[PDB]
Amino acid sequence: KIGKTLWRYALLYRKLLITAVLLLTVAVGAELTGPFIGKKMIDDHILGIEKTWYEAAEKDKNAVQFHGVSYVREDRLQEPVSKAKEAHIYQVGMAFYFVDQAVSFDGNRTVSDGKLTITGDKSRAYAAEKLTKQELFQFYQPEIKGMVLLICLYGGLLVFSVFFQYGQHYLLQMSANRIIQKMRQDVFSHIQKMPIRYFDNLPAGKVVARITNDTEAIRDLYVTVLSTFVTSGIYMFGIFTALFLLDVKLAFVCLAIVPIIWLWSVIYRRYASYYNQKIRSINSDINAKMNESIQGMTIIQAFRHQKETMREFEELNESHFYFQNRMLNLNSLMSHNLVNVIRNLAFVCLIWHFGGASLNAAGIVSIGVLYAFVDYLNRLFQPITGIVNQFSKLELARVSAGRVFELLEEKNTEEAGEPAKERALGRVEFRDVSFAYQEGEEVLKHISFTAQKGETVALVGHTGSGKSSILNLLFRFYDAQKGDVLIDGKSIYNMSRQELRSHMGIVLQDPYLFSGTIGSNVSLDDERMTEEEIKNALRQVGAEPLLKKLPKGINEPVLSSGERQLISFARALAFDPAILILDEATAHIDTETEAVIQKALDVVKQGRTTFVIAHRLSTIRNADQILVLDKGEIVERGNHEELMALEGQYYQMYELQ
Amino acid sequence: FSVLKKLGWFFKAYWLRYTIAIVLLLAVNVIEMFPPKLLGNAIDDMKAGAFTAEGLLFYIGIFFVLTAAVYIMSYFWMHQLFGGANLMEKILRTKLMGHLLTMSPPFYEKNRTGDLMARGTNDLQAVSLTTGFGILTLVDSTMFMMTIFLTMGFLISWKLTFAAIIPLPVMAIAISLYGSKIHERFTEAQNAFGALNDRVLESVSGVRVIRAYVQETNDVRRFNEMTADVYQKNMKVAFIDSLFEPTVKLLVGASYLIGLGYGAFLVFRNELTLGELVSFNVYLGMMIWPMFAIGELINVMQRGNASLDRVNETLSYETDVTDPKQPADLKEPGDIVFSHVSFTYPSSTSDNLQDISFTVRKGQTVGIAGKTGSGKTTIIKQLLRQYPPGEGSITFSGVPIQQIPLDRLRGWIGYVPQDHLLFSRTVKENILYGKQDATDKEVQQAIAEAHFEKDLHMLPSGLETMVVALSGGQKQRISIARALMANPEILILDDSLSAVDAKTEAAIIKNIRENRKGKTTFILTHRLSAVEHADLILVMDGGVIAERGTHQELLANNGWYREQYERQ
Numbered sequence A: 001k002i003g004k005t006l007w008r009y010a011l012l013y014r015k016l017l018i019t020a021v022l023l024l025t026v027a028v029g030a031e032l033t034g035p036f037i038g039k040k041m042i043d044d045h046i047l048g049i050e051k052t053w054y055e056a057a058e059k060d061k062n063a064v065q066f067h068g069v070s071y072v073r074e075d076r077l078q079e080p081v082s083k084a085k086e087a088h089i090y091q092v093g094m095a096f097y098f099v100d101q102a103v104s105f106d107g108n109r110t111v112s113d114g115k116l117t118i119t120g121d122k123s124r125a126y127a128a129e130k131l132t133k134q135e136l137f138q139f140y141q142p143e144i145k146g147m148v149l150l151i152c153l154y155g156g157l158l159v160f161s162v163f164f165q166y167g168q169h170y171l172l173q174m175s176a177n178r179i180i181q182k183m184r185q186d187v188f189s190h191i192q193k194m195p196i197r198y199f200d201n202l203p204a205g206k207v208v209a210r211i212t213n214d215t216e217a218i219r220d221l222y223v224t225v226l227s228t229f230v231t232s233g234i235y236m237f238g239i240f241t242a243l244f245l246l247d248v249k250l251a252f253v254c255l256a257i258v259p260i261i262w263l264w265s266v267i268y269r270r271y272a273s274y275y276n277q278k279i280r281s282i283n284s285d286i287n288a289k290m291n292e293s294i295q296g297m298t299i300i301q302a303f304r305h306q307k308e309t310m311r312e313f314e315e316l317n318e319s320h321f322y323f324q325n326r327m328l329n330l331n332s333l334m335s336h337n338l339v340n341v342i343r344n345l346a347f348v349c350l351i352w353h354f355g356g357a358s359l360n361a362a363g364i365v366s367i368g369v370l371y372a373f374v375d376y377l378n379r380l381f382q383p384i385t386g387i388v389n390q391f392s393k394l395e396l397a398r399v400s401a402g403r404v405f406e407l408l409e410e411k412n413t414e415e416a417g418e419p420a421k422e423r424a425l426g427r428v429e430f431r432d433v434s435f436a437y438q439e440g441e442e443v444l445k446h447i448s449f450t451a452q453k454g455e456t457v458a459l460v461g462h463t464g465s466g467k468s469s470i471l472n473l474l475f476r477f478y479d480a481q482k483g484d485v486l487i488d489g490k491s492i493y494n495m496s497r498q499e500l501r502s503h504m505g506i507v508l509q510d511p512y513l514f515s516g517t518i519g520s521n522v523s524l525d526d527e528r529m530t531e532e533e534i535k536n537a538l539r540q541v542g543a544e545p546l547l548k549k550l551p552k553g554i555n556e557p558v559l560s561s562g563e564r565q566l567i568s569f570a571r572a573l574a575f576d577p578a579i580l581i582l583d584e585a586t587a588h589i590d591t592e593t594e595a596v597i598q599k600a601l602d603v604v605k606q607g608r609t610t611f612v613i614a615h616r617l618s619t620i621r622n623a624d625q626i627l628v629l630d631k632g633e634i635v636e637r638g639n640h641e642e643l644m645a646l647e648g649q650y651y652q653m654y655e656l657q
Numbered sequence B: 001f002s003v004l005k006k007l008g009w010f011f012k013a014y015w016l017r018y019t020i021a022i023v024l025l026l027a028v029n030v031i032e033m034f035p036p037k038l039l040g041n042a043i044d045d046m047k048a049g050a051f052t053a054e055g056l057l058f059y060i061g062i063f064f065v066l067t068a069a070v071y072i073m074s075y076f077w078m079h080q081l082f083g084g085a086n087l088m089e090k091i092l093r094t095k096l097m098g099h100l101l102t103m104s105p106p107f108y109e110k111n112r113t114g115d116l117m118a119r120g121t122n123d124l125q126a127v128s129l130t131t132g133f134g135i136l137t138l139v140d141s142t143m144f145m146m147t148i149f150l151t152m153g154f155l156i157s158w159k160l161t162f163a164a165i166i167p168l169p170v171m172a173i174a175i176s177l178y179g180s181k182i183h184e185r186f187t188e189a190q191n192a193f194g195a196l197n198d199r200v201l202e203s204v205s206g207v208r209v210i211r212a213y214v215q216e217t218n219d220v221r222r223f224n225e226m227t228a229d230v231y232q233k234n235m236k237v238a239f240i241d242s243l244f245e246p247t248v249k250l251l252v253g254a255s256y257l258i259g260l261g262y263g264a265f266l267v268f269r270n271e272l273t274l275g276e277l278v279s280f281n282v283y284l285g286m287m288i289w290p291m292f293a294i295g296e297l298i299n300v301m302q303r304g305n306a307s308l309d310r311v312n313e314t315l316s317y318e319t320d321v322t323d324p325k326q327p328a329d330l331k332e333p334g335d336i337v338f339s340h341v342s343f344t345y346p347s348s349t350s351d352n353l354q355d356i357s358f359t360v361r362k363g364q365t366v367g368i369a370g371k372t373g374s375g376k377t378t379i380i381k382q383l384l385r386q387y388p389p390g391e392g393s394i395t396f397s398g399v400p401i402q403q404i405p406l407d408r409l410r411g412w413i414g415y416v417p418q419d420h421l422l423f424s425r426t427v428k429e430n431i432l433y434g435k436q437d438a439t440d441k442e443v444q445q446a447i448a449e450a451h452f453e454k455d456l457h458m459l460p461s462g463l464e465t466m467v468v469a470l471s472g473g474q475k476q477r478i479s480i481a482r483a484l485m486a487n488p489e490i491l492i493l494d495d496s497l498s499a500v501d502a503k504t505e506a507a508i509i510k511n512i513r514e515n516r517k518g519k520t521t522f523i524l525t526h527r528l529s530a531v532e533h534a535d536l537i538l539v540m541d542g543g544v545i546a547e548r549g550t551h552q553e554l555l556a557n558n559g560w561y562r563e564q565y566e567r568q
């Protein structure tokens, strides 16, 4: 379910959406009343002369003067209610002729000299007279002010439409952006509430994509649905309302055209989905092949495989090109020439309708309606191609929405908890633990021990022997399947995770360096400040702080591999943990961290209960309790000195090289 | 439009499709001016007293004929133009891949993988878009626009067209300016979004520490701050993106209003007719598009020029290793020898190698072991023709490597890379790189000789795994089995056995000794057990062999006593 969640999230920030819809409606009203001003201007002012004329008063009674008499139209006239002394202006060819008498039924007209007879029954012939270019202008003059008023009204409505179009678009974009921001905040909160089991299986790229790229896709969808579908729907509804207001017998034709959009939309989407899916799949295959060839080119050259890899690449290229050509054919046929054909068919329909009206009618013809229809149909047929394009595109956004909302709907989670004021003394008791990452497996068989207030405990075992699985099990990243762990007098599983993790701190093989300043890194930007960071420098960091270019050595990514461990131990010292679960540290890689790794380790280890998983076994000379891992079980204990562990190959002379 | 000239070769190769496209485009442009003028004439006839059913039939039929002709010719020119665009894209892709397949390691050191992938993924798109769409927009701006303008100037009016055309140049200028501004704000906002993505990835990778220090609230706060910043940048982008529709709407409504008003003030003077006014309105409506086409051209031409200038630069890179002219006719390699070889990796320190001055007689296998960084894979790198020649002479029984051709030499040498590079393809076929003929069962025999027959069922299915990058200790075994099936005159084992067990190591090495008997075999390892049999053992110290003695001379002299470690 994608639409339901999208609608629920859009209901948040509904004020912006409603305001955008209202502003869009006002703008559409203005733009679509423009063409109605056009129709009125054409029909009343340019075609005004066609109407009947009557004898006029001497003064400017909406009157015009012709020879020794003056006439006035039947509309601007003011109730003389005279039926005789009529007049008419009749257009033939390109010239207008004046008829001093009422001609009764009117039809087709042809003039020989002064007849201008009206031809279904040819018996009526009036007396005519040609109108000079000056006479016609004099007759048309009274409508100049109405022309001016309508032009000014058109301009004013246009500027209002401009303002409100800008407003509605801006508010739609604001609503989409705010919705996406809320979605991102909620997604990151849920990610922070997830369990480590979820993180371990899925690579980092997958979670980052789900957080930031699918949300961008949702943003694209929201902008597409809001600005192109709702906007176009309102625009078409307004256009059709205007057309119905103009002529009803000619708007039903456009209503019947509306299904054309649906039919072609579905057909084009049906073919486009297939063609685009194949094109995308083959393009991904080609990119993967090119990447797999650039990497590992040396072997391809060595085995002279340059004639077969190119063969497969050319086969993929041919398939992709063929599908691209088919897509081009479909696009050309369905979309654009089809829009043109529909537009020309609409023109033909207009001509047919109005010609049929005109052939047997006297004054039925109205060219203002024709012009308004032409303008409205030009506007209507603009965005259809975009509509079908977005309709075909929506599938990818739908898939991304499905992914994101499946992530958000996950039920398995953990409660937040709160930090505990009490500092648990150094005590970690293992009554027994049995842990496995699968079902039916046992990675840790039986491990039992206890650590005192001050001790250095280390784990002994071969690579992949569950040495840091106990680090995982102690922070409650992975809960114990059947065993129990005990800190102080209560089991680890009876307390909130955030209370436990306050007691104890970690340092890993690869120090995770956080973006920002070095001082920020050693503090992670917490409330604690002042000597929190500086104290690390006064404990075991002496050379780096003297390199003080900016507060606490403000600097940028990556240093090397020694300063990383230095920063990690500085962090562990600043946070003042209790149990300080350490991890394998690779220490001689640089110089023994300038021969300071041991100093840092044994200064942080003081006054704690510290677990060392160090690969090098010489660094654990001091340990009082040293444990071993029989692939998840303790089979002996002791120390390099206390017991015989130094002998018996368990502590190899090879490890001491 | 320098991009259209740099592609002269393509247009010269394809001149029929493009000349047909231009002819059809011009014909369609000329034909499309008829419908609106016929509408104007029909309205004029309507108003006058001369309109009969015959005229209506004439107009309907001629409109249908023009519609059909425009449809068919439009389809054909679009097909003939975008087929050319697709052809150019395919040609560029096949040229780029063919060039990459000839490029040696030095080029890939100079050129990063990301740059090459971008050139083969995006620049080709830009050049193909140029070839098709840029031509379309050039025709639209140069011919369609002028055609419509002259039609409105001649048939309808020369004053009305001048009056109603003023806003459209301003519309084009404003569109260009707002495009530039929106592009700038969009690149800024994309930088902000990239920073947010980097923060998200960095705080989701090291989640272990973040949770262990109960800092999962400051992380949320920082993410919220980054989201607020990216939202602010997006709103900055929107502030300008919302200025496109209003400006075009204003400057097109003004054009329609000017046309209608100044035609109503002209029809009064009897210098027009309503049919001509409607024709003018339709002409403006269709003339709208060239205004956008001009900007589209002015943008696509520059983008294509840059991308093509990038695709051509990466294509015209001279081959690092030169196949010799008039290669010497040598059937097989006999006693290899190095006279004085001091190689130097391009962009390296000092020499990195010095005269090796050793000989490997035909059939006598030599093992080289030593210190990391001293260089033992550099000898085989010299021998593989991967980097240009060094110094002295690498004499292959009289004729140096530089004269033997690349094809035959690559035929002789069987190479097992230290860094394993097997491809993501069927294991049965991945092993088959050595020889494509494959017979049927020689692959099984090679598996047995390499001792990979230990794989009975432990891998999924049989000989079909997509080695999805399935893990295991089978990668080295597959590499050695492939190199063995190749049946090479010279076998170069680069630290191949650095992962298998000692028992299997002895099995493999003694099998190679007891199966590759009349041919050379190079063993490179850091463990002195595999080189045990070698009749001339070399231990390299920095850039010079410490001594040239055999196993007994080596173990006696003051070289490196690591076999004294004995590893047990």
Ligand SMILES: CCOc1ccc(-c2nc3ccc(-c4nc5ccc(N6CCN(C)CC6)cc5[nH]4)cc3[nH]2)cc1
Pocket (backbone or CB within 6 Å): A030, A031, A032, A033, A034, A035, A158, A378, A379, A382, B248, B249, B252, B253, B254, B256, B285, B288, B289, B292, B293
């Ligand atoms: C009250 C009077 O108010 C009016 C309101 C609107 C219009 C109006 N009528 C139009 C007809 C067509 C177009 C239009 N034609 C186009 C062709 C191409 C494009 N492109 C090209 C590529 N990029 C630039 C975007 C899409 C946009 C296009 N927009 C715009 C139009 N604007 C006229 C008067």
Ligand SMILES: Nc1ncnc2c1ncn2[C@@H]1O[C@H](COP(=O)(O)OP(=O)(O)OP(=O)(O)O)[C@@H](O)[C@H]1O
Pocket (backbone or CB within 6 Å): A200, A201, A437, A438, A443, A462, A463, A464, A465, A466, A467, A468, A469
């Ligand atoms: N995060 C994990 N996801 C899945 N399986 C895991 C995970 N951690 C350990 N395992 C399981 O551990 C076994 C592989 O060895 P394991 O990962 O236990 O070595 P290790 O505990 O990391 O030890 P060491 O630190 O010594 O390398 C398999 O059963 C594997 O499924």
Ligand SMILES: Nc1ncnc2c1ncn2[C@@H]1O[C@H](COP(=O)(O)OP(=O)(O)OP(=O)(O)O)[C@@H](O)[C@H]1O
Pocket (backbone or CB within 6 Å): B345, B346, B347, B348, B352, B370, B371, B372, B373, B374, B375, B376, B377, B378, B418, B495, B524
């Ligand atoms: N890209 C390179 N450019 C220059 N010199 C290089 C490059 N890669 C490696 N070298 C040189 O080769 C050394 C590492 O590879 P080399 O084969 O010379 O020694 P090795 O490590 O003993 O061999 P192996 O790779 O078998 O372990 C580097 O220390 C340097 O001297």
Ligand SMILES: [Mg+2]
Pocket (backbone or CB within 6 Å): A465, A466, A467, A468, A469, A470
């Ligand atoms: Mg572990």
